[PDB]
Amino acid sequence: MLPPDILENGEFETIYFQTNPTYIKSPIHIPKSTIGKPDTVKIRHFFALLHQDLVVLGLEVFVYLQIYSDFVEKYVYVSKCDTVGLEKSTIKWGKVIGPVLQYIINYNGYKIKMKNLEYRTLPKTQNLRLCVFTKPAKEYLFPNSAKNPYKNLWNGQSLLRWWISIIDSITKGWNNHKLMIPGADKYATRKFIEKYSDWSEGHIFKKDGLAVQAIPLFPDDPKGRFLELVIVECRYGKMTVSRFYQELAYRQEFLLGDCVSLIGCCKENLEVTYHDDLVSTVTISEYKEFMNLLKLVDFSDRVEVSNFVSNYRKSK
């Protein structure tokens, strides 16, 4: 999951666990007329890097498996990524996030139970979709960490350049690499990807039809927050994909934001082999319990951070 260069024989330690694969309703609205509706299985991935007894880096990724008869539409959604900054870093965190995210993208050892009415076998043909949004918040995962002396505080453009470099390195040979900065003109968006030959402006989802039937609603996604409003306000039967992205540029999160951008990459018709890889798997409640404890930690306080790490090491 990580190179020996990064883990110096235990000076560093990883927290990594998945939720048990859980059936959910589709994040992309399928009609009820829809013929051949897929089953959607969601897996949460949490990764954290530890240096001695302190958290230094965190990454949360959600994997959605839209299981059809002959293939899987596999969506990999980066939920949150953050650093702590209590110590002088010494490590370029892209050299950790990259390999970890690539591991999560390519993981195919899920223990999926059969749909009711022993483990379900996934189709081998899988179409990958990697979905990332960039928005320079101060503390995505680690509260009060923006106060730390060695935390790098992104601006919108530097965070986008950082994510483009990471995603490009782990999506080599993929069918497309799409970047959209809602509200920016094409020339400004093109500047970020001028040195990336495989990247183009736009998005990866279906270009026409209703937006709710093409664009997935991910949790805590600026894109998804507008999709939520379209559904609540009952505009889901009228707003096209084109009109959605047009109006997305005028949302407060984007128009008042700092280079808030949306990245998508696809790889089509990848033959995957099932390969179990024994990792820590937890119930959803145990996952949320961990995440709720992490939200109550003062990550400006080495005492509270070391205590949180100590309590997790006890629970395994």
What's the rounded Cα separation, in Å, for the pair 291 and 129?
A: 25
CB 16 within 8 A of CB 257: no
Active site residue 298: no
What's the rounded Cα separation, in Å, for the pair 168 and 15?
A: 25
The closest of 134, 184, 164, 148 to 302, measured between CA atoms, is 148
18 located within any domain: yes
What's the rounded Cα separation, in Å, for the pair 147 and 149?
A: 7
What's the rounded Cα separation, in Å, for the pair 199 and 175?
A: 10
Q: Which of 168, 198, 208, 221 is catalytic?
A: 221
As for how many domains the chain has, the answer is: 1
**Resolution of the coordinates, Å:** 1.6
209 located within any domain: no
First CA to last CA across the chain, in angstroms?
20
Six token digits for residue 286: 């145990």
**188: Cβ–Cβ under 8 A, 6 or more apart, which residues?**
181
221 located within any domain: no
The residue segments making up the domain with residue 286 are 12-174+266-314
CB 182 within 8 A of CB 248: yes
222 located within any domain: no
Distance set, CA 154 to CA 8, 73, 135, 234 (Å): 28, 32, 9, 36
Distance set, CA 94 to CA 100, 203, 223 (Å): 10, 24, 24
180 located within any domain: no
| Dihedral angle of Cα 160, 165, 166, 169, to the nearest 10 degrees | 150
99 located within any domain: yes
Method: X-ray
Six token digits for residue 221: 């996604």
Contacts of residues 157-161 at CB distance under 8 Å and 24 or more positions apart, as own/partner, are 157/192, 157/258, 157/259, 159/134, 159/135, 159/259, 160/134, 160/192, 160/259, 160/261, 161/192
249 located within any domain: no
Rounded (to 5) percent helix, strand, coil in the chain: 30, 30, 45
108 located within any domain: yes
> Hey, which residues does 81 pair with through a beta bridge?
59
Pairing of strands 39-51, 22-24: antiparallel
Pairing of strands 39-51, 12-19: antiparallel
